[PDB]
Amino acid sequence: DRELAILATAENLLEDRPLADISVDDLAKGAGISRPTFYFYFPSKEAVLLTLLDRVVNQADMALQTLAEDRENMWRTGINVFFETFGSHKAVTRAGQAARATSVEVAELWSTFMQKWIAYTAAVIDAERDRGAAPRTLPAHELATALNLMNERTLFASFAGEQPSVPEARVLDTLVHIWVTSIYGE
Amino acid sequence: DRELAILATAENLLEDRPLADISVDDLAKGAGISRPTFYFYFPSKEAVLLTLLDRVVNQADMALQTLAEDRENMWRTGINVFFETFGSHKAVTRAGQAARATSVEVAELWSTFMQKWIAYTAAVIDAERDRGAAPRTLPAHELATALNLMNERTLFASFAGEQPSVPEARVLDTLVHIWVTSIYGE
Ligand SMILES: O=C(CCC(F)(F)F)N1CCC(c2nc(-c3ccccc3)no2)CC1
Ligand SMILES: O=C(CCC(F)(F)F)N1CCC(c2nc(-c3ccccc3)no2)CC1
């Protein structure tokens, strides 16, 4: 509604600058509403970012669910959900990652979804071991945890152009290599 | 001197609480000096953390240099330098990681050492490929980047007891598995 215009404005401004340099006034002005009208839809600019991040993590989650309904290509398509979804929302991903430090709600959102994505990873590794396609090496949930944390750090360093980082055009191939060798390697 | 007592005090208090809840007064009081005497040695409590982190990253770096003067055990000993060094300084590591967001000096320190550690990793992978012990798969510097970023995120999640995290007692074996399979796996 006006809610969607507030969310579009905040995502648009986050591309230009950090949430510290965005006023509820910029957000109201972008959405064609007054400041007190903003406060009807959101308590803070921090609450706007939480909603933007909730939409992006659920978009990734729903795409992974769709997939779940050649072993290298299987993992590549799964990693690609996160590459494309977060890569299509870099400003929100970057701001949301930074807000984990200062928002308990943002930290718990991120934590909830990582636990879900790790549990799905471990379940697929377990299924691969059960069909005899993968060796019983590390505990599957521990392997999944380290690989998902690798993806989190690597994808977000690439998207931010951090030094150091894998170039964005090389990051999917890099991560697929490490997943497939670590999951199938004896 | 008095400098060492300020640094010992700050590391001691960081174990109890975050740098936000430590006053220059706590630091002065711990070191048996006055507040203005503190300002003779350090401009801010933020400068104390920068020095503490510089000492820890250089301790790791010097231990790695010592090492550099069975392939699974080679990588295990190298990863162990970082596990033991950072694991022996969890309060400083945790505070230092958080300060990357709000200190350019802390972010550039961390960046400098990651670039060095990635370049050393890539050089060892290159040497392993040159002696025919490792296959020419991914670009060595891209593989090294992702593996080092994996270690950074995984070690620091374990030490902080984040949810999710690999249990501290399982994190070295977890990371050695993923390094050896990804470096030696075809
Ligand atoms: O990368 C992230 C999370 C990234 C983040 F958010 F930063 F951590 N992944 C988490 C989920 C992984 C997965 N794929 C499949 C699958 C199942 C069926 C068919 C195809 C694939 N199951 O689990 C892909 C990689
Ligand atoms: O884990 C980190 C960095 C961790 C951080 F800081 F979080 F990123 N490592 C970076 C350095 C790696 C390495 N080991 C050896 C070696 C050489 C000779 C003999 C034995 C080992 N060469 O490179 C070990 C893992």
Curated annotation (Swiss-Prot), chains A, B:
DNA-binding residues (ranges): 23-42
Transmembrane region(s): none
Disulfide bridge map: none
Keyword line: DNA-binding, Repressor, Transcription, Transcription regulation
Any one GO molecular-function label of the UniProt entry: DNA-binding transcription factor activity
A matching Pfam family: EthR_C
Location of the HTH tetR-type domain: 1-60
Function: Involved in the repression of the monooxygenase EthA which is responsible of the formation of the active metabolite of ethionamide (ETH).
Classification via PANTHER family: HTH-TYPE TRANSCRIPTIONAL REGULATOR ETHR (PTHR30055:SF184), HTH-TYPE TRANSCRIPTIONAL REGULATOR RUTR (PTHR30055)
Quaternary structure and interacting proteins, as annotated: Homodimer.
Protein's recorded name: HTH-type transcriptional regulator EthR
Organism from which the protein derives: Mycobacterium tuberculosis (strain CDC 1551 / Oshkosh)
Organism placement in taxonomy: Bacteria, Bacillati, Actinomycetota, Actinomycetes, Mycobacteriales
Gene name tied to this protein: ethR
